[PDB]
Design an enzyme around this catalytic site. Structure first.
Site, mmCIF file in Angstrom:
data_model
loop_
_atom_site.group_PDB
_atom_site.id
_atom_site.type_symbol
_atom_site.label_atom_id
_atom_site.label_comp_id
_atom_site.label_asym_id
_atom_site.label_seq_id
_atom_site.Cartn_x
_atom_site.Cartn_y
_atom_site.Cartn_z
ATOM 1 C CG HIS A 122 20.703 15.603 17.457
ATOM 2 N ND1 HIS A 122 21.506 14.479 17.433
ATOM 3 C CD2 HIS A 122 19.501 15.201 17.918
ATOM 4 C CE1 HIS A 122 20.817 13.441 17.858
ATOM 5 N NE2 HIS A 122 19.584 13.857 18.161
ATOM 6 C CG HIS A 147 25.874 18.620 17.311
ATOM 7 N ND1 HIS A 147 26.628 17.653 17.946
ATOM 8 C CD2 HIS A 147 24.765 17.997 16.853
ATOM 9 C CE1 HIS A 147 26.008 16.494 17.865
ATOM 10 N NE2 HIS A 147 24.862 16.678 17.201
ATOM 11 C CG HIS A 159 22.958 16.813 21.208
ATOM 12 N ND1 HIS A 159 21.848 15.995 21.264
ATOM 13 C CD2 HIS A 159 23.893 16.137 20.501
ATOM 14 C CE1 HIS A 159 22.105 14.866 20.631
ATOM 15 N NE2 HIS A 159 23.353 14.929 20.153
ATOM 16 C CG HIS A 194 18.925 13.569 23.998
ATOM 17 N ND1 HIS A 194 19.199 14.325 22.877
ATOM 18 C CD2 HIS A 194 18.391 12.411 23.556
ATOM 19 C CE1 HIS A 194 18.851 13.652 21.801
ATOM 20 N NE2 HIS A 194 18.352 12.475 22.191
ATOM 21 C CG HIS A 247 19.911 18.876 24.665
ATOM 22 N ND1 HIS A 247 20.688 17.803 24.264
ATOM 23 C CD2 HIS A 247 19.857 18.819 26.012
ATOM 24 C CE1 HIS A 247 21.092 17.135 25.325
ATOM 25 N NE2 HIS A 247 20.596 17.737 26.409
ATOM 26 C CG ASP A 258 17.309 17.262 21.973
ATOM 27 O OD1 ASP A 258 18.470 17.127 21.536
ATOM 28 O OD2 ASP A 258 16.972 16.988 23.142
ATOM 29 C CG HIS A 307 23.929 11.421 15.234
ATOM 30 N ND1 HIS A 307 25.088 11.379 15.982
ATOM 31 C CD2 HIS A 307 23.355 12.617 15.489
ATOM 32 C CE1 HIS A 307 25.208 12.499 16.666
ATOM 33 N NE2 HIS A 307 24.156 13.275 16.383
ATOM 34 N NE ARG A 324 29.190 14.164 16.733
ATOM 35 C CZ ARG A 324 29.553 15.175 17.516
ATOM 36 N NH1 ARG A 324 30.135 16.247 17.003
ATOM 37 N NH2 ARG A 324 29.329 15.109 18.817
HETATM 38 CU CU CU Z 1 23.595 15.052 17.259
HETATM 39 ZN ZN ZN Z 2 20.286 16.463 22.477
#
Ligand code: CU
Ligand code: ZN
Ligand code: CU
Ligand code: ZN
Lengths: 151, 148
Positions: free
Chosen positions: A49, A51, A67, A75, A84, A87, A124, A141
């Site tokens: 992702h 952020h 995000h 999401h 997002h 994403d 992640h 993370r």
């Molecule tokens: Cu993320």
């Molecule tokens: Zn997201």
């Protein structure tokens, strides 16, 4: 002068991980080409992702924040409309912990309200299921990096 | 509007230079606060470079000094300077380096936006005279400036 055509992001690991790599965002005719090459990932699918905060100063990558969602949408997956801006779905690591990923993202840009420049990339520990809100149950993370202007 | 900017510097090949740099918008200008470790004792070149690319082992991918006005290399206090001329950072005998000052040039939006640019720490001192680098030499650490 010339508008930004390329973006580069070196991800470094969070505390108690060896996840490193480089991600390039190149402008093409029908969107932005995302190319990612990572190492030190556990075998399997990992949440991948953009952020909102470009801050990787935290040991656990919490400083990256949520995000990157400037439209206040839900999401989802990259192919989804309801997603997002950050994403980018999952990245998959092989038995050797190497992970490659290349695709055309039609949402991300390098200027304006939805600019990814100065935002963070987060990898992640677990898979992003692309259903659960607001994270996709991706969990902890393992790596953080800031997206910069390329040449 | 973006009020804060953060940059984690990681070392280039054959160096242990790491740290965090924050840019906070304040009365007058932008407050630069830098805390580094693993620097050799003495003054080190400290600049914002045009490309936010730290993918190179030697930090060459950061490119030249962030100079969108095509001006000469100088000191932070100078008018004739690059947007990314933050002068030198000084490391003590233990290799710890602190630096805080108010930069009146840097901003977080527009032509001169530092967001998405790179921070570079050099091996040698920036003499603030020699062109176009200040004879700062090799790059010991690289980092990308992100939105706080
Ligand atoms: Cu993320
Ligand atoms: Zn997201
Ligand atoms: Cu420099
Ligand atoms: Zn300069």
């Amino acid at each position: 002068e010339g508008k930004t055509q390329k973006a580069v992001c070196v991800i470094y690991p969070t505390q108690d991980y060896k996840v490193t790599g480089v991600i390039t965002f190149t402008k093409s005719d029908d969107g932005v080409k995302v190319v990612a090459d990572l190492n030190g990932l556990s075998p399997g699918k990992h949440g991948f992702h953009i952020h909102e905060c470009g801050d990787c100063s935290a040991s656990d990558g919490t400083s990256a924040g949520g995000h990157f969602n400037p439209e206040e949408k839900s999401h989802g997956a990259p192919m989804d409309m309801s997603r997002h801006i950050g994403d980018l779905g999952n990245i998959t690591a092989d038995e050797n912990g190497k992970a490659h990923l290349e695709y055309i993202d039609k949402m991300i840009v390098f200027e304006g309200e939805h600019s990814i420049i100065g935002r963070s990339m987060i990898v992640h520990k677990n898979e992003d299921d692309l259903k659960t809100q607001p994270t996709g149950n991706a969990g902890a993370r393992v790596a953080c990096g800031v997206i910069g202007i390329g040449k």
